[PDB]
Design a binder for this molecule. Structure first.
Ligand SMILES: CCNc1cc2oc3c/c(=[NH+]\CC)c(C)cc-3c(-c3ccccc3C(=O)OCC)c2cc1C
Length: 165
């Protein structure tokens, strides 16, 4: 499978996190949460705040310590001045396997995400299950078959994996 290796410094992310039961229905709630964020002007409002650290809107999957699963819609921003209205987290610095899903959203992303998870199962000592992973949606027509969503999967110690030796 094709991927690029990328590294991020610690970043500040501003947005809204919701929490679901780890879901066979999760994708339905995530759809609804996207729909609501657009409908309520939240996406537009976050887009203003995007400081450019990452180009686009993030959909982060955040593991919770009670086993639940959170999804956060966010942008790289600057201020905890937004805490009144928004969730603000620090995305801790990490290396990533960065994959591309090309096709109309969400179908291409869902399908690519299945392939990714199956691919990365061979890298159990190198993925980081407690670290967020995310979809990155850059500017473009997400209905276009050429639209590319990036999938960022955090890794540690990947250079030691025997497949690279
Ligand atoms: C700039 C990024 N813009 C978007 C990103 C989106 O990401 C989505 C991720 C999803 N899961 C994780 C992969 C699911 C389930 C739905 C998503 C939708 C979506 C949500 C509700 C209803 C329709 C769609 C839909 O994609 O709109 C198509 C017209 C979505 C829509 C837009 C506009």
């Amino acid at each position: 499978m094709e991927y690029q290796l990328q590294q991020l410094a610690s970043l500040t992310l501003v947005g809204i996190k919701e929490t679901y039961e780890n879901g066979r229905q999760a994708q339905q709630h995530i759809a609804g949460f996207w729909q609501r964020c657009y409908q309520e002007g939240v996406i537009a409002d976050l887009q203003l705040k995007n400081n450019g650290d990452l180009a686009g809107i993030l959909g982060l999957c955040i593991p919770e310590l009670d086993g639940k699963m959170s999804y956060m819609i966010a942008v790289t921003g600057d201020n905890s001045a937004d805490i009144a209205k928004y969730d603000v987290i620090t995305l801790a610095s990490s290396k990533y396997m960065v994959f591309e899903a090309q096709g109309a959203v969400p179908k291409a992303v869902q399908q690519k995400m299945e392939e990714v998870h199956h691919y990365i199962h061979q890298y159990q000592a190198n993925t980081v299950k407690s670290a967020p992973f995310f979809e990155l949606y850059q500017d473009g027509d997400t209905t276009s078959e050429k639209y590319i969503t990036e999938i960022w999967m955090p890794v540690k110690g990947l250079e030691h994996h025997h497949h690279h030796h």
